């Protein structure tokens, strides 16, 4: 509709803070309107939060101006298979955080490429590498995007799945380090170079659907687990801090993330989820999602973890 001139200065401040630059004609105006709608959503939700109506609050992060198109791509990262098509095989502490054991690399920024599946996969493998060599090394998601393609049912920036990615690493007998094969957020020619192989994968394990109890076990005894969640919600996109719980969440997952732990805040149990939307998303790039709440957002619907 029409912008609110009283917000002009703040809109300017917001753009500068996140380095927003709109070079296409009329893009500016469209972005401004999306931003205002999200601001009102954020404002109302935090108001409710101030009245103790939610265990989490929202913020105008860099996604505050995301378009319908960009949301689409974002929600197209996961090409999840059918449940019955998963080779399901496979006392615990009340809390776990693999970051404390130095098994989680710094958060990545997928940008405008739907490669969440790849980041989820390497993330899970990065932990196993550290537990095998003692050295934490970021693995190449780009390598998965460019190489683990059609043969594995993956479509680079147009989506894919973690298990087929692990299968590629196994078949390929290795994956490059992110440093030698950096992420470009684009579908490019496969450039795998065995000379810079930083890790290998021998197998992966898929966990039984909707079993948050089993997911808890794997996270505590095996390590970070690759999972898909339903993130098709403004609440998720603008999540700032706290325990995320969205009554409108479903089990139809669309975004690949990594469970690196679990715990509870003031009684509210949660999954410590590493995202791939940079450090300015949520809690330093992480989101704590509701645990033991009927498989909230389908977090336990497609769990899997690799092994060196």
């Amino acid at each position: 509709l029409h912008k609110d001139p009283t917000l002009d200065h703040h809109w300017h401040l917001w753009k500068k803070t996140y380095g927003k630059q709109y070079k296409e004609k009329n893009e500016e105006a469209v972005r401004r309107l999306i931003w205002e709608k999200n601001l009102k959503f954020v404002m109302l939700h935090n108001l409710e939060h101030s009245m103790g109506m939610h265990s989490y609050d929202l913020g105008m992060n860099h996604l505050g101006d995301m378009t319908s198109e960009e949301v689409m791509s974002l929600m197209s990262s996961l090409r999840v298979p059918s449940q019955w098509q998963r080779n399901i095989t496979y006392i615990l502490p009340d809390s776990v955080d693999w970051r404390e054991k130095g098994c989680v690399t710094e958060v990545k920024y997928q940008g405008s490429c739907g490669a969440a599946w790849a980041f989820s996969a390497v993330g899970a493998l990065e932990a196993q590498l550290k537990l095998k060599t003692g050295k934490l090394v970021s693995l190449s998601a780009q390598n998965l995007v460019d190489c683990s393609t059609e043969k594995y049912g993956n479509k680079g920036c147009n989506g894919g799945f973690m298990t087929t990615a692990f299968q590629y690493i196994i078949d390929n007998k290795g994956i490059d380090s992110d440093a030698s094969y950096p992420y470009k957020a684009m579908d490019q020619k496969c450039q795998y170079d065995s000379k810079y192989r930083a890790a290998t994968c021998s197998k992966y394990t898929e966990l039984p659907y909707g079993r948050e109890d089993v997911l808890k076990e794997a996270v505590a005894n095996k390590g970070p687990v690759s999972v898909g969640v339903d993130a098709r919600h403004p609440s998720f996109f603008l999540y700032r801090s706290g325990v995320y719980y969205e009554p409108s969440c479903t089990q139809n997952v669309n975004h690949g993330v990594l469970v690196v732990g679990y715990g509870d805040l003031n009684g509210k149990e949660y999954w410590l989820v590493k995202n791939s939307w940079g450090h300015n998303f949520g809690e330093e790039g992480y989101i704590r999602m509701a645990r033991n709440k009927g498989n909230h957002c389908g977090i336990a619907s497609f769990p899997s973890y690799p092994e060196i």
Side-chain angles (χ1 to χ4, degrees):
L1 27 67
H2 280 297
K3 72 182 187 69
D4 183 346
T6 67
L7 276 42
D8 285 351
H9 178 57
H10 287 71
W11 159 241
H12 163 69
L13 294 173
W14 185 81
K15 290 186 296 173
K16 182 203 172 198
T17 299
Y18 301 97
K20 295 296 177 172
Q21 191 75 203
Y22 310 117
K23 299 177 191 174
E24 305 186 35
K25 190 184 177 186
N26 302 310
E27 180 180 2
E28 169 90 32
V30 174
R31 294 282 187 183
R32 171 60 176 279
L33 294 190
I34 296 176
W35 179 85
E36 289 196 10
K37 176 187 279 63
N38 281 325
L39 213 212
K40 189 177 183 168
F41 188 99
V42 167
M43 164 194 84
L44 294 173
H45 178 282
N46 289 349
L47 209 199
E48 293 169 46
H49 173 79
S50 70
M51 302 188 279
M53 288 173 64
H54 304 285
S55 47
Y56 71 100
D57 64 347
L58 305 179
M60 288 302 282
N61 56 32
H62 65 283
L63 300 179
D65 67 348
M66 188 161 49
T67 63
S68 189
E69 185 184 14
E70 301 170 327
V71 171
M72 178 64 68
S73 172
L74 218 61
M75 248 67 258
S76 300
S77 284
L78 285 185
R79 311 196 89 279
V80 296
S82 300
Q83 261 309 323
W84 61 88
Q85 279 178 168
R86 302 201 299 129
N87 199 325
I88 303 172
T89 52
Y90 192 61
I91 184 170
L92 321 162
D94 302 318
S95 295
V96 170
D97 188 340
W98 285 98
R99 289 178 300 183
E100 302 181 324
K101 307 183 190 306
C103 291
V104 190
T105 68
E106 289 292 330
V107 161
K108 308 308 194 295
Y109 188 81
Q110 61 182 88
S112 64
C113 166
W117 56 277
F119 284 107
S120 176
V122 296
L125 183 51
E126 281 156 8
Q128 299 299 309
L129 181 56
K130 202 283 190 301
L131 289 173
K132 179 57 158 291
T133 64
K135 53 165 174 53
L136 183 62
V137 183
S138 288
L139 300 180
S140 182
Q142 193 60 52
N143 187 174
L144 291 177
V145 171
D146 302 334
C147 311
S148 179
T149 58
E150 296 65 50
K151 204 264 199 174
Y152 301 84
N154 301 321
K155 294 178 172 177
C157 291
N158 291 310
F161 199 61
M162 299 71 96
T163 49
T164 59
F166 297 138
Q167 189 54 239
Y168 155 83
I169 300 172
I170 300 176
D171 301 344
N172 190 64
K173 290 181 176 180
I175 182 167
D176 285 327
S177 70
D178 178 80
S180 69
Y181 199 158
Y183 182 73
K184 304 271 172 55
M186 294 182 267
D187 289 299
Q188 314 191 129
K189 165 170 63 69
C190 174
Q191 285 201 297
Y192 177 69
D193 192 332
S194 58
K195 179 181 177 185
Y196 302 95
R197 170 169 53 212
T200 66
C201 187
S202 62
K203 67 164 180 168
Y204 66 89
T205 300
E206 296 188 279
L207 302 184
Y209 159 82
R211 306 216 54 171
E212 299 188 79
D213 56 313
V214 178
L215 174 57
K216 181 182 178 182
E217 185 178 314
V219 179
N221 301 320
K222 292 289 156 47
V225 173
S226 292
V227 300
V229 297
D230 170 2
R232 65 171 184 61
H233 298 94
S235 52
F236 188 104
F237 305 140
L238 308 178
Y239 165 84
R240 184 197 311 225
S241 68
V243 177
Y244 178 83
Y245 176 71
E246 170 58 61
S248 65
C249 236
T250 74
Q251 260 84 308
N252 298 313
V253 303
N254 44 51
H255 178 55
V257 289
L258 181 69
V259 174
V260 300
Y262 58 76
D264 72 78
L265 173 62
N266 298 166
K268 302 289 185 178
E269 300 184 295
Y270 65 73
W271 289 113
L272 180 56
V273 177
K274 181 190 191 193
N275 201 345
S276 56
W277 299 346
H279 291 83
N280 303 335
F281 167 80
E283 293 170 349
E284 313 277 59
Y286 290 70
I287 175 175
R288 280 182 287 178
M289 298 174 68
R291 181 166 62 94
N292 298 324
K293 279 285 189 289
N295 185 26
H296 186 62
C297 298
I299 193 166
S301 301
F302 296 84
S304 74
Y305 69 82
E307 286 182 65
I308 303 299

